[PDB]
């Protein structure tokens, strides 16, 4: 059954039917056992494709909305805003879905440093995606929940993973984006990203055969952000 679900998740991924990949991997998560690296990754890809489709839609519609505000077409504005809201409803439902799977199933069953950091960082990512479109109280609560999860992931990562580890780097990259895009803090975003990058450069001997390409790519992204932000 667990192997069958993995197989079905992999078929859905090949067919680019990410909804189905999510349903298959959600059933694996629901077994209340430690996921393998492969399963963790399948689950995370599934949801990142599902949410990423709506985030890309959201950003297109919001830009359209911004163009129309500049020309004051209010009939158009009406429909664009109603359409945005609908996509926001979907983003909320999807984030709420994985955040429940994380809280119910994933985080309670996680018993390795690596998996705990991966799931807390995921929790940080999904609150952060809530925060991207949230205003008012919702934005504050999403930002606080994201911050808490990313600090929790950081606490474990600092003690349990080498600074070159791809999940630790991935956490640094996304938490720096969080400080930049949600907390509006370019200075803290830059420090976190720069620290993560310097700490890995200091310990390049910790680079693993399994993930040196993954580490190198994240370190290049940390650098691309720092470029973008300074």
């Amino acid at each position: 059954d667990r192997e069958d679900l993995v197989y079905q998740a992999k078929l859905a991924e090949q067919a680019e039917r990410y909804d189905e990949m999510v349903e298959s991997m959600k059933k694996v998560a629901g077994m209340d056992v430690e996921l393998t690296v492969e399963e963790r990754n399948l689950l995370s890809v599934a949801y990142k494709n599902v949410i990423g489709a709506r985030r890309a839609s959201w950003r297109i519609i919001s830009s359209i909305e911004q163009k129309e505000e500049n020309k004051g077409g209010e009939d158009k504005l009406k429909m664009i805003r109603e359409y945005r809201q609908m996509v926001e409803t979907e983003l909320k439902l999807i984030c709420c879905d994985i955040l429940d799977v994380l809280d119910k199933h994933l985080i309670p069953a996680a018993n390795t440093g690596e998996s705990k950091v991966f799931y807390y960082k995921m929790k940080g990512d999904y609150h952060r995606y809530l925060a991207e479109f949230a205003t008012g109280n919702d934005r504050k609560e999403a930002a606080e929940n994201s911050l808490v999860a990313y600090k929790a992931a950081s606490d474990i990562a600092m003690t349990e993973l080498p600074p070159t580890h791809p999940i630790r780097l991935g956490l640094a990259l996304n938490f720096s984006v969080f400080y930049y895009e949600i907390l509006n803090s370019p200075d803290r975003a830059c420090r976190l990203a720069k620290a993560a990058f310097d700490d890995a450069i200091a310990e390049l001997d910790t680079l693993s055969e399994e993930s040196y390409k993954d580490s190198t790519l994240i370190m290049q992204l940390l650098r691309d952000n720092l470029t973008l932000w300074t």
Binding site: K48, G170, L173, N174, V177, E181, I218, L221, D224, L228
Partner: peptide, 7 residues
Amino acid sequence: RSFSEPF
């Protein structure tokens, strides 16, 4: 527009 971890 910042880069986050790819997938």
